[PDB]
DNA sequence: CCTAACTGACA
DNA sequence: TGTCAGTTAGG
């Protein structure tokens, strides 16, 4: 816990190297270095649009079609949508839907 | 509309 | 412990 403040530049661009070293499945070790930032927070920041692996890019016609269809079969099973969309994992497509497309198209 | 952050719930 | 699910939060 602790450091309730937003994820600083000295966390975001620091955890950035730790994932390239360990991988997005060692949040137990990641948190060991960030101390306060528990594995949960680390993953939340990461899985969204922090990932350099997931080059920052906004949704467009060619990506809107992904949630428009996936949400038509899965709906709120972002777990499957995520795996079906190599890149935008969990929060990526989820956060997008219920923010940009919460108005339902 | 786009990404960030914590909180609530689940496997 | 890691992931999923949702809203609130800042941009």
Every domain of chain A and the residues it spans: 1-56, 57-105
Q: Are A97 and A88 in contact (CB under 8 A)?
A: no
Nearest to A34, CA basis, from A5, A1, A75? A1
User: Beta carbon of A51 within 7 Å of strand B?
Assistant: no
User: Beta carbon of A69 within 7 Å of strand B?
Assistant: no
- The yes-or-no answer to whether A1-56 and A57-105 have a common fold is yes
The protein residue nearest nucleotide C4, judged by CA to C1', is A79
Q: d(Cα A7, Cα A10) in Å, to the nearest integer?
A: 8
Residues in contact with A83: Cβ distance below 8 Å, sequence separation at least 6, in sequence order: none
Fold of the domain spanning A57-105: Arc Repressor Mutant, subunit A (1.10.10)
Q: d(Cα A38, Cα A43) in Å, to the nearest integer?
A: 9
The token duo for A69 is 């269809």
Method used to determine the 3D structure: NMR
* Domain A1-56 superfamily per CATH: Homeodomain-like (1.10.10.60)
Q: How far is the CA of A48 from the C1' of B9 (A)?
A: 19
Strand B footprint nucleotides (protein C-beta < 7 Å): 1-9
């Amino acid at each position: 816990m602790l450091i309730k403040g937003p994820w600083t530049k000295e966390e975001d661009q620091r955890v950035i190297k730790l994932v390239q070293k360990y991988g997005p499945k060692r949040w137990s070790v990641i948190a060991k270095h960030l101390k306060g930032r528990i594995g949960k927070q680390c993953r939340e920041r990461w899985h969204n649009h922090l990932n350099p692996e997931v080059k920052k890019t906004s949704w467009t016609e060619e990506e809107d079609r992904i949630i428009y269809q996936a949400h038509k079969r899965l709906g709120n099973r972002w777990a499957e949508i995520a795996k079906l969309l190599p890149g935008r994992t969990d929060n990526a497509i989820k956060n997008h839907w219920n923010s940009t497309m919460r108005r339902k198209v």
